[PDB]
Amino acid sequence: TMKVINDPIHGHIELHPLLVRIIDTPQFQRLRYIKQLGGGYYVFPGASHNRFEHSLGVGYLAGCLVHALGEKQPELQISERDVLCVQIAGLCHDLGHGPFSHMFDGRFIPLARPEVKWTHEQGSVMMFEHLINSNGIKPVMEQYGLIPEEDICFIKEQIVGPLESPVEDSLWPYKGRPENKSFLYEIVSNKRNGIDVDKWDYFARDCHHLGIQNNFDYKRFIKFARVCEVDNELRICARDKEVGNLYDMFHTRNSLHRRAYQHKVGNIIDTMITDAFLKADDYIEITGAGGKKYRISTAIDDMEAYTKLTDNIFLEILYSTDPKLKDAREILKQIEYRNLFKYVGETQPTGQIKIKREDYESLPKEVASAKPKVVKLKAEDFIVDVINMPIDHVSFYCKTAPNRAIRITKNQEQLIRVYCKKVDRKSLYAARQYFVQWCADRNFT
Amino acid sequence: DTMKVINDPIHGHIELHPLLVRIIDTPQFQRLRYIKQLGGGYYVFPGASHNRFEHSLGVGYLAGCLVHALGEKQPELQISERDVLCVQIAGLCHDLGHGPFSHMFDGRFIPLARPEVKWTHEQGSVMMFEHLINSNGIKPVMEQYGLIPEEDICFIKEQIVGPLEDSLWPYKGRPENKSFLYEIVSNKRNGIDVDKWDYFARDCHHLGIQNNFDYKRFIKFARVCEVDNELRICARDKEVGNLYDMFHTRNSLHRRAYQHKVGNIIDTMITDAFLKADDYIEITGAGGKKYRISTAIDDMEAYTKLTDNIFLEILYSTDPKLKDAREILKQIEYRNLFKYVGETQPIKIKREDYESLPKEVASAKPKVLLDVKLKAEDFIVDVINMDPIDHVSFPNRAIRITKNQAEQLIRVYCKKVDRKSLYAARQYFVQWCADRNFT
Amino acid sequence: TMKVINDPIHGHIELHPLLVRIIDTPQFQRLRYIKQLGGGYYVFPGASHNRFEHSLGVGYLAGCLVHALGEKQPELQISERDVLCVQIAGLCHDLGHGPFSHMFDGRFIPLARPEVKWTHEQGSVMMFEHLINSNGIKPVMEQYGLIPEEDICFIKEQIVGPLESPVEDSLWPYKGRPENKSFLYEIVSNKRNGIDVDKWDYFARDCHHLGIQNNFDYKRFIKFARVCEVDNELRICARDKEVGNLYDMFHTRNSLHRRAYQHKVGNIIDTMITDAFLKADDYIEITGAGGKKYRISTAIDDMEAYTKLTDNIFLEILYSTDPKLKDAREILKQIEYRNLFKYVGETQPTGQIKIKREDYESLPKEVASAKPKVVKLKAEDFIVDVINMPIDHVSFYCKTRAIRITEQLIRVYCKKVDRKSLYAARQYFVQWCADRNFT
Amino acid sequence: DTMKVINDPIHGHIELHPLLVRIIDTPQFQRLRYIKQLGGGYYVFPGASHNRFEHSLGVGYLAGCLVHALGEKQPELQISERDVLCVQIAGLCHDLGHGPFSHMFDGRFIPLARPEVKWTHEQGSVMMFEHLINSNGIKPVMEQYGLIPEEDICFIKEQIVGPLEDSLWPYKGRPENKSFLYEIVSNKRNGIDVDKWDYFARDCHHLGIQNNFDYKRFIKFARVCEVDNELRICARDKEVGNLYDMFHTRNSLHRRAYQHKVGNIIDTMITDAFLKADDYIEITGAGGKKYRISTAIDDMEAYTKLTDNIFLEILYSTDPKLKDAREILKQIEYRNLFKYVGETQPKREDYESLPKEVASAKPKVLKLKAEDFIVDVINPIDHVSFLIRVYCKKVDRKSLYAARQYFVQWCADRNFT
RNA sequence: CCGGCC
RNA sequence: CCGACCC
Ligand SMILES: [Fe+3]
Ligand SMILES: [Fe+3]
């Protein structure tokens, strides 16, 4: 058979029934109610896109890029099973994300359970394993040509990376897929070369749903790629006559990152929503496997509970009558009545990074908030927003050149902000005083 | 204060006066953030996830632009501030009363569950606006900026709903001199209005429909003339071509919105699930009152807290009674969807006895001629009547030179998708069509 | 006075009365009858664009680029005296092109007068000087704030460069403007960075008239350009987020110069037109001032005669019944019946370049073409077309002072027979390759 | 031989049959390379430098595509390769009769020069095609590739102009059952043809105007049906908006380009130059006869060399007799043009003496008037789906108001207001 | 304004 | 595969 899904950004995205069966399942539709770009919802009016369009675009792009590379280089005779595994990994382009999208593994789960080491690529891999084990797809994976012993290892390594921690520079620590298909591990999720379909898809989707000028045209980049050996190792490389397209892509990436993903009021609302969701973690719970009340913070330990972790929790604070949920609803109401936290002051740290994960960030900030730097009163619960998170690409090899044409490498960490809302004018003066104190205190920022 | 500005993908920068901001900054208006215009179409159309907040902002912007263009083009209208504020407030209501899942709630859900209650979203918008004004103290601000609530609010409600009440000016908020301002946003007569234009533009932007319509030119070329006997806002320029392609795209995406096959079944399933879950989810009102799922329309204080979230309130529900109901929602998350048993074409139907339409369907589908078994309540019949181009186009008269040139499907989707029952369903559909009235 | 010109590429081109006075002269309408691609029209049916629109576009682009630099960087004191002066330099950057553009000085003049060195930039300078002295342009130059004694020298240096040859590396060899305006010599005629308005405009025009994809957009480059000091001097630099745009521009340049300016049949037709002019050089007289009869080749020595030397001469040979022009006319007729000189072979030797300009090129090629390279007989009527005519030199700003980040093709042509000519062409290509420094 | 391909900015690749190539690569067809499409409109639109050569190639391509699509779609019409080649040849040779500056030569010049002869450029196209066939030896090739000259040539000529001669099928090139092939290229009745599509597309390409009509879709949705009594080509699908946009494009092109005031003034000045230089320009025809500019239409040997070059051949002329003519050309060099004197609304040969009546009314208004009188009047629907301009020769600023008043008085007195 | 449709 | 070479 053959299914096809219409998406506005990548047009017609064609899928095969294994990919659909993984896709059209309860543990992916949860994404339909978690916005990919969360904190702009009350800042950028049009940025209401959900994870569905982002995942669809990533799947379409990965399929096109792996189908072009193999018709324009039919010397290795790759197998459909590998592409299916890569597509499964790609459909986890943002899968692990929970409420408020990237916040869940960005600023929610690490902030609430500081001792827990969890990342959303590993979470996506585990959720995919749960989907396989619950939805009964493995027998039909072996029926329709996939071997879990090697295909599952390949897909898991594509999704997460090096599963183990072997320390050997002159070795390939990836036994999931044989090196005769090494280039296949730079198509769906690559963090070193930077040629990944995810960035393309989410740049195009964010531009389409925000009305910003996106010039990049991935069709030419996909259509002009071949596998070439660079330095005793094989990498997928594009042609010389595309460097302007990738410059446009990089400028689109930077424009999207600096307009939205670090917006002032966007980050302020992100911080307020994240704090309100976090502070109610234990007493507004969902039930997982075995009926255990494994709360939102602890829901990372089980996938059955982790399924029901969506943006609804936000609303579940806004429309709740319980006395314990009072504070959350109150704060949300102050968000609705335009009593937002107005923000003033910014810095960037140069002294390596913080010691703790996020706990000590607030306490030192509150401490340094007060100082005798020449209004009245004083406070301690004032916010501290810490955001942590020229194409440097050498995959320009030419197909005609067997192992050359690198074009001489194409020729050539945290932002902290404050917010004071004591009074109409008193808050501005207090914010200036605190900005002075914190600046003189933030490790000589 | 002064103008605020909000960026939208459709109309770019939308500049609003302080009164419009005060209207926008309300819980009863920010509730619209979780109301998708295309609603259920999301489960079959990926990108159509826009919300009612931008739709309201866009309708307010379009109405302000229209009134400003009319004022600049025709100084003889003598536009004042009361008209501008009232028109903006009425414009920002282009879906104001819409509840959970918008047109699904009143087009298919509320009328199906309890046919005895009159539910139209314009009256709900009027009640919600009244609650907003009363709670938020809007009347003092309206006095503060010079507009008169006693007539502007009545005019806004009439524009939101229609006739205020002997075929002599049913609207009692404005005299006969402002005969064109009442069709800037709603325009129940002609069928082309700023609400439809703006939401067409936004739907085509977020759905992949190719919209060739340029609304700015139409706005810039508006003058007030006489059509038959009274004043009517007529398009000064000859935009017949543009509006031809406009109605083409309108039919394209209007019929795209009324989805077929998968979309219709998904919508019906969602509705039926809400109807089953009505008893197992409670909504709190004002004064401690608890109104059931369907009866929450009678109080605007409680209706302010009615958004799509009720959907989620079943998806996160654990009370045992809703169990079955929750499963039906699950039935659209996973791909085990039911197939539709056909469609047919036909006034004989109103807001009464529609809830028994499947029963008559059950009269023909079960126990059909030469048919054995396969009989149940599988009928989930859908009636979508709801509410060339044949455009009506409704300094000294005689210039309005007009140029030269129904029932929806009887769709009964079978709740049970059994493969064995497929042949029985085909036979039942043939018998039903050839028996009742249709083909 | 304020003129506006509609161009397909640049839209509305605004000009001021000095530019109009220069334009509406006999020595500019001469450009209107000279093909941009002389031998490209007999290959591309759309390439009928003339040098007139190209000059208009180049002048407009130069004016825009010098007008932006001074509004977004008002430290170099750019005045109305400078913008018009530049625009004039751009508008006359090709004023001296002869019949069939680059052919006239590319292959004709070296064949006709090998002892005289001629380039169409010198022709532009001489034609502009004649225009100034004859059309009374000095009074209106002085009327609109210009000093002809220095402005004419500045424009002439803009067209060609250093009028004199001073022996000093560390010197400013221009008498037009001091080094405080060095950037002004990087707008119309650039030899190092390759970013000049001339190339932009003629690339855009060739793309419009050849159906090629034009990715470069000069509007963004203009809007994001500033003057920056690189090596003790001022140079025009773009923004960092434009390197893809300039890569697209360079690839457009390469594609245009490998499709059209190196086209096989285009160059063959260029050679045929050149031969027809040569055979008719002695029998065609043009009369200037004083009745003096200057031939086609010698008309470069008088501008009054050189004005009336356009592409019409081609037709003036074709529609001629004079027996002495017979041979020339014959060749032109062979162009119409498409009896072109068939060509086989294209080699480039590694032994530097050709010694003479055009005379010794033909004779040695024909002579060496015959050898016992393992048909029969021999001939000497074989032409030899030798055409001579990567992003590091382009500098751009780094952020918001910033600095930069971190040749002879020879072809032949034999038109003997369908098979004999091919064999002889292969034999001659073998012989020339084995003889011309083991080419 | 083999199929040829020509690159055009409008239609991309244009594939031609070898017979079409043999027809094209002839002097009487390559003559179109030096005849401007818009003609005098070029001196008003610097980008409109396209010629009739690419227009003819494009019209041939469009007609071939349309006929091939009709043949493939509906086999009951029994369209063969002979019909396709004949339609293509009629497409390529539908404007061979155009003279210098295209429509100016017969719309403005011929009626003044020779009012006793009725001359339309379609007849010139027919005569030029006949001369092309006879001189270039096309008939052996037409016989070689399956065409039958005795009737195929008559069919092509009929497609160019129409009936050579009881209201019963006047055409004699093909039977009455193929009544739709006669309106693919010319289409005098319906008014939509490949010629109009191609020259609209090219005008919009070279003028900056927007082109909304996609001809490929219309071709792909074309079927032959019956409206009243006979077979007629029509758009089977409802491309009504596309056709309305095409007609809007037609109206815009006609209003802006073909009716520009300065364009008409340029045409009038070139026309006056030709009328003055008629007696003193000799063109060698066939048999050594010398045909004037006006009398070169009677012999195709002289008419082959009658192109826009004669313009330049007056501009650079040194004979004293041509002096006056050259001087009038000199005016365009300095943009000295006739000024506007007003507009008014109501055969070209009868209007040859028009200015005299203008001199009858402009003089002694409520000779200088005769001198300044340069009057050049130059004066969806039925589709199956699913003004006077007296250019003022005297450009005197003081006399401008008097000339305007005289023209107004003349118009408001004689027959108009 | 004689190469604008403001 | 001489008005193209890969649109
Ligand atoms: Fe140039
Ligand atoms: Fe024509």
Side-chain angles (χ1 to χ4, degrees), chain D residues 105 202 212 218 226 271 276 317 329:
Chain D
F105 186 54
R202 208 161 295 267
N212 295 323
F218 187 98
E226 181 182 11
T271 299
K276 302 199 74 171
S317 61
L329 291 195

Side-chain angles (χ1 to χ4, degrees), chain C residues 36 51 54-55 58 90 93-94 97 102 120 188 197-199 201-202:
Chain C
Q36 171 86 5
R51 289 283 180 186
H54 158 80
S55 59
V58 165
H93 84 282
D94 288 326
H97 269 118
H102 287 1
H120 77 266
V188 175
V197 298
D198 168 74
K199 288 185 185 304
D201 172 71
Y202 87 79

